[PDB]
From a paper:
Serum amyloid P component (SAP) is a normal plasma glycoprotein that recognizes and binds to amyloid fibres in a calcium-dependent fashion wherever these are deposited in tissues. In summary, the structure of SAP is comprised of five identical 204-residue subunits associated in a ring 95 Å in diameter and 35 Å deep, with radial symmetry creating a central pore 20 Å wide. Each protomer consists of 15 β-strands (labelled A to O from the N-terminus to the C-terminus) arranged in two large β-sheets in the form of a flattened β-barrel with jelly-roll topology. The β-sheets are held nearly perpendicular to the radial symmetry, creating two separate and distinct faces: the A face, which contains five α-helices, and the opposing B face, which contains five double metal-binding sites formed by the coordination of six localized protein residues.
We also report a high-resolution analysis of the interaction of N-acetyl-d-proline, a substructure of CPHPC, with SAP in comparison with the l-isomer. Crystals of the SAP–N-acetyl-d-proline complex grew with a 45-fold molar excess of N-acetyl-d-proline in 60 mM Tris–HCl pH 8.0, 10 mM CaCl2, 84 mM NaCl, 20%(v/v) glycerol, 17%(v/v) PEG 550 MME. The molecular-replacement solution showed one SAP pentamer in the asymmetric unit and an estimated solvent content of 53%. Five d-proline ligands were observed bound to each SAP pentamer via the double calcium sites on each subunit. The puckered proline ring plane is parallel to that of Tyr74, but the penetration of the ligand into the pocket is not sufficiently deep to achieve stacking of all atoms. Rather, the proline Cγ and Cδ atoms interact with Tyr64, Cβ and Cγ interact with Tyr74 and Cβ interacts with Leu62. The proline NH is 4.2 Å away from Tyr74 OH. The peptide plane has been built as cis; this was a marginal decision based on the proximity of hydrogen-bond partners (the side-chain amide of Gln148 at 3.9 Å and the hydroxyls of Tyr64 at 4.6 Å and of Tyr74 at 5.5 Å). One molecule of glycerol was observed binding close to Pro29 on each subunit. d values show a 2000-fold increase in the apparent affinity for binding of half of the double-headed CPHPC compound by the SAP subunit: 8.8 nM compared with 18.6 µM for N-acetyl-d-proline and 322 µM for N-acetyl-l-proline.
Author numbering:
A (entry chain E), B (entry chain D), C (entry chain B), D (entry chain A), E (entry chain C): 1 to 204
The structure:
């Protein structure tokens, strides 16, 4: 219930402590989802963008940046990776959807679709998650790793319990996202832990 | 008899099992043909795009991607290769024609002609093929190789028993192909085997 | 009290001793500041752009170019670094701000914001500085290092005791800078030491 | 005489056999000449573009591609080479002129002049040539070398017994060449030997 | 007293002999000068562009190209070098000025200023020079070096006994140079020695 429109979280340093917890009242396992957000980082090493863990389940839903031009999604421990030509460093808009019935994961980078990949067909992503920005969880809420920490800025984060069609991905990219029912940047419940600063978004 | 307009086959993972069989009424050997399709893959290793084998004849008609920027056509186990400047990764539209009387092979990449090459002048491509997408055949219908598997998306596949002139190549590229009499994306008989998913084409 | 409009300092050679002292009656420690200037150098080795030391304190406020595309700010010996795509050699406009309350350092290169970083939250930059262009200080006013010397041209330098908003940054870059209260190019007090020549600015 | 307007010779494979003989009625030594043609090849090794030998005299007039971006002219066994930034692979339009009185050779690539070079000032290129496309001659009409063979397509070839000024070079590049008196694509006397196929020009 | 408007000197081969002597009415030592000319060469090795020697003094005023993207000026055997982004091979317009009072050398490449450098403050360039294009002098008029020879084309050369302001540099670049009192392409006294050919300028 905080509207962060026009603002970003800044993770201004590398650490094993700095992070934001995102709170969602999700109690039903997910068959489908889409996650979109905007990020600006000049890290060359790998890092976690979005870490969603549940009780007894590490890497239940994880968006991980392997290196420049390579984006990975983990579902239930398994992963897929797709490549893109991108400038570095540069602000980026990232969406990824996943659909249990087919296992298909769709990444979109700056409104451009990456090659589809597939994993975990028939799997249900569990609910009552702990969701962390800034660090990658290895436990339910913790066990961070400095070498996976995100340094930079994140904004405009939305998560839906459905697979967005292309037009709705583009809406989000263009700054007019459709209402989101899992996480909503315009009505976000979060906890800052450590050194995270909220600043205006100046790089769009 | 299936209309796949606006859809693609997604081969969402590397494997030695996942493939699509394409079924054609072909009992007469081929003197002339054109084959067009659209593909999107972020593999950098080599892979088969279109594998056509006949009884006792490996690589009877094979479209094979050597590496970024290099496309090969095999006719009757002989091969030619032509080069092109292309982005990686990127969607591509590929056409290739071959004419027995001259032996000339013409590749067209995104509506741009590659340098013509020639092979097997006077040869007839054998009939009663097994045609496979997703894997490269070494037997009549099988003996696949994981290191040659296609991971990504293929759509808009057409095959004609004639050599198309440039305007019809361009028309296919532009999404208004001439009706095709060997294989036709709008009236396709196919068999999915293993993990292959049909999805909307979102990258044109 | 000198108007350097349309002029630059030229540091025309590598040396250990050529430099300009910038004089400001700065008696109270700084909680906030912004520094903007234009520079043109074809050095590929590291160099100091702006060196501010106080008695007994090295690198109290230092803007340092590590290598092409990498800009560093030191506050009380601690540093942050941010990256940018830039041409080399090329003239550049650089602004950097820092805010004690948040620790946030903002670099802007040719009116483009770099990724925010953060350091020294709650700190105050010490007053009574010696401020040097052309050389990096390791003592209070001296102990230079030719391998860190700046060779090239600097102009349009301003320093304010506040964090400028983006509109004021862009005005400095391409419009009328807001008059500045610590250092101001239209009313600058300076001392030339060694081989430094004032010339018209010809590269904007 | 044959009008090859809108057509090309296709040398579809590497060989020591495949070539075209061109026949001119001139029957005089050459003091001045210009030669223009279009070519499209994806060879990265060296190759002969135009080979003119006379009785007992190798490399009497030879246009030879050393590697991407490097064009050589031999006159009377001596050579010059000039460089250009060019795309690879790509269609190219090539003109070269030579003037005995000055020795000056001018290459023009896609209507752009390369650096002038000079050779054989005062020499007369011998009369009664054998002129070959597709292979490099080492004898009067033969002694080819597969490692110097041209694989690809050639069209729009014209040769004049004078040095064309820039405006006439550009006319040739644009597809409105002045009528030519040594060799003329619109009234060409030629002999195909081995595997050379005439096809429509599809790459302009 | 020869008007070379629209023409260039072509140095069509590497040699230790080919050169042009430029003859000037200059008789007093030089405190200030500007030298502009256009050049086109595809040499990648080092070479001399303009060699001005006086009795007993090598490298009295020398414009030397170290390698692509790097231009050097020698005054009285001392050297400065400045860098630029340039295409290779490509025609270039080069101006360089030097002012004894400050020691400042200003290179301009295609109307774009390079970083200023400084040398020989207070020095007077000696009079009664021998000025050579095509070779680098090590004696008063001679002692050439094949590995420093200029191969290619030079035109539009002007030398003034003052430091030109930017507007006048740009005029020369654009083809409307001010009349020049040391050397002037429209009223030039020169001696061709060896293989140098005058041709029309075709690459502007
Ligand atoms: C998941 O999404 C698909 C469309 O992608 C939809 O057809 C399906 O009903 C969704 N499943 C659930 C449980 O909402
Ligand atoms: C194949 O093409 C050639 C030339 O285009 C033509 O002569 C021949 O009839 C074609 N063959 C068939 C069966 O159409
Ligand atoms: C400086 O900005 C701070 C935040 O660091 C702000 O709260 C304060 O008012 C400013 N301090 C001064 C001396 O202007
Ligand atoms: C070749 O060109 C030169 C120009 O130098 C001219 O003098 C000469 O007559 C030309 N030769 C012929 C046969 O036209
Ligand atoms: C050289 O230039 C300076 C300007 O800095 C000028 O004062 C001086 O007179 C010039 N010398 C001559 C002989 O013109
Ligand atoms: C161990 C490791 O490198 N990674 C990469 C992201 C997921 C997984 C982890 O830390 O849990
Ligand atoms: C053996 C091999 O490397 N290749 C490449 C494509 C055709 C052929 C094959 O697998 O049959
Ligand atoms: C020691 C060193 O390499 N540096 C780089 C700039 C700051 C610091 C110094 O010279 O004081
Ligand atoms: C021997 C050789 O390498 N060459 C290159 C072209 C001309 C010459 C020849 O084969 O005759
Ligand atoms: C010796 C040498 O390499 N050089 C480079 C230019 C100046 C100087 C000379 O030849 O005189
Ligand atoms: Ca984990
Ligand atoms: Ca971890
Ligand atoms: Ca096979
Ligand atoms: Ca195989
Ligand atoms: Ca220091
Ligand atoms: Ca130091
Ligand atoms: Ca030969
Ligand atoms: Ca040969
Ligand atoms: Ca010398
Ligand atoms: Ca020398």
């Amino acid at each position: 219930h905080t509207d962060l429109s026009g603002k970003v979280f800044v993770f201004p340093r590398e650490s094993v402590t700095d992070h934001v917890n995102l709170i969602t009242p999700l109690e039903k396992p997910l068959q489908n989802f889409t996650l979109c957000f905007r990020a600006y980082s000049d890290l060359s090493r790998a890092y976690s963008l979005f870490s969603y863990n549940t009780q007894g389940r590490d890497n239940e839903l994880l968006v991980y940046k392997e290196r420049v031009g390579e984006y990975s999604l983990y579902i239930g421990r398994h992963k897929v990776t797709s490549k893109v030509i991108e400038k570095f460093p540069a602000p980026v808009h990232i969406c990824v959807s996943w659909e249990s019935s087919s296992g298909i994961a769709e990444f979109w980078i700056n409104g451009t679709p990456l090659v589809k990949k597939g994993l975990r067909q028939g799997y249900f992503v569990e609910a009552q998650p702990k969701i962390v920005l800034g660090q990658e969880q290895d436990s339910y809420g913790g066990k961070f790793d400095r070498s996976q920490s995100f340094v930079g800025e994140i904004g405009d984060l939305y998560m839906w319990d459905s697979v967005l069609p292309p037009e709705n991905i583009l809406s989000a990219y263009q700054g007019t996202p459709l209402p989101a029912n899992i996480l909503d940047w315009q009505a976000l419940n979060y906890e800052i832990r450590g050194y995270v600063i909220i600043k205006p978004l100046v790089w769009v």
